[PDB]
Design a binder for this molecule. Structure first.
Ligand SMILES: *[C@@H]1O[C@H](CO)[C@@H](O[C@@H]2O[C@H](CO)[C@@H](O)[C@H](O)[C@H]2NC(C)=O)[C@H](O)[C@H]1NC(C)=O
Ligand SMILES: *[C@@H]1O[C@H](CO)[C@@H](O[C@@H]2O[C@H](CO)[C@@H](O)[C@H](O)[C@H]2NC(C)=O)[C@H](O)[C@H]1NC(C)=O
Ligand SMILES: *[C@@H]1O[C@H](CO)[C@@H](O)[C@H](O)[C@H]1NC(C)=O
Ligand SMILES: *[C@@H]1O[C@H](CO)[C@@H](O)[C@H](O)[C@H]1NC(C)=O
Ligand SMILES: *[C@@H]1O[C@H](CO)[C@@H](O)[C@H](O)[C@H]1NC(C)=O
Lengths: 106, 50, 99
């Protein structure tokens, strides 16, 4: 509707019998391939991302957001548990970090 | 015969995704007309010339 | 022996010009739009196309409409069957009714 991309701003300017809009938009530029999975098995649980994508750089699995590559370790804060491992197609096996474990190991 | 565009093929797979690692800020220009000339015609003088 | 209406139109100075874009090229545009939508989602509408599995694309749509993606990922076969049945119903309706 306002510029090709994700719209940020628009600036109006006058013109003879008209108006000129300067649309400031966001365009993703430099791309990268990744190996992805919908959910992660962990102790019979199917962890899904709260917001972002499960990706892998070949060895480890991280979670990012969709429009920008920013990998983070998969914990229980950015994932939620729903169902078991026997339903979702394409699930993979990986561990999920728990921040409460070093606090309870004191 | 005109060219529709450059042919491209998306490297689709059921376990592969592409995520951007950088961005750019694009400011484009769009021109829209709003008004035009307000003409007025003297009907009798145009037809008859006084 | 029977004069045509198009011949009667053409004999009196009325002519129909052909369109600039032919139907094969319009079909090529729609094929490109369909392939881009299937293989990338909305990402081909904002820049270069980013590949993504269609289950993840439909999970994006489900999260967009306000439904948690486990509903898709636990009912994927049922949703695919419903989409195939709806496509077949569209096929049968367009094959039967001409209105
Ligand atoms: C995937 O990313 C992880 C996190 O960056 C990598 O793990 C570390 O990689 C660095 C190299 O930059 C090593 O020095 C560290 O010892 C690694 N740490 C661990 C715990 O493995 C991992 O190597 C990456 N995998 C690739 C690139 O295949
Ligand atoms: C993301 O892209 C921007 C430009 O689109 C990059 O910024 C340039 O980086 C080079 C690196 O030497 C500089 O020479 C240029 O002067 C920079 N341009 C501007 C406008 O500052 C940026 O480095 C990219 N980021 C990554 C991580 O690749
Ligand atoms: C991803 O992989 C495909 C297939 O190997 C390759 O054609 C493409 O250049 C890669 N990179 C991107 C950004 O799609
Ligand atoms: C992706 O599809 C290929 C063939 O179409 C199949 O062999 C492979 O197992 C599929 N991958 C997953 C994760 O289902
Ligand atoms: C994940 O682990 C379970 C039990 O440890 C096993 O049954 C299953 O095959 C594993 N899946 C993969 C993809 O390794």
């Amino acid at each position: 509707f306002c510029g090709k991309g994700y719209h940020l701003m628009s600036f109006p300017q006058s013109a003879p019998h008209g108006v000129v809009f300067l649309h400031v938009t966001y365009v993703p530029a430099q791309e990268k391939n990744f190996t992805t999975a919908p959910a992660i098995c962990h102790d019979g649980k199917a962890h899904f991302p709260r917001e972002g994508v499960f990706v892998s750089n070949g060895t480890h699995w991280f979670v990012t957001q969709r429009n920008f590559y920013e990998p983070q370790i998969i914990t229980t804060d950015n994932t939620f548990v729903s169902g078991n491992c026997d339903v979702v197609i394409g699930i993979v096996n990986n561990t999920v970090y728990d921040p409460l474990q070093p606090e309870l190991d004191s | 015969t005109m060219s529709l565009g450059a042919e491209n093929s998306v490297a689709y797979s059921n376990n592969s995704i592409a995520i951007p690692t950088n961005f750019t800020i694009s400011v484009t220009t769009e021109i829209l007309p709003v008004s035009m000339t307000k003409t007025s015609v003297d009907c009798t003088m145009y037809i008859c010339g006084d | 022996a029977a004069r045509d209406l198009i011949c009667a139109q053409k004999f009196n100075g009325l002519t129909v010009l052909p369109p600039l874009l032919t139907d094969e090229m319009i079909a090529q545009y729609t094929s490109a739009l369909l392939a881009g939508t299937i293989t990338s989602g909305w990402t081909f509408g904002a820049g270069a196309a980013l590949q993504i599995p269609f289950a993840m694309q439909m999970a994006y749509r489900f999260n967009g409409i306000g439904v948690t993606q486990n509903v898709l990922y636990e009912n994927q076969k049922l949703i695919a069957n419903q989409f195939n049945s709806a496509i077949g119903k569209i096929q049968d309706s367009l094959s039967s009714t001409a209105s």
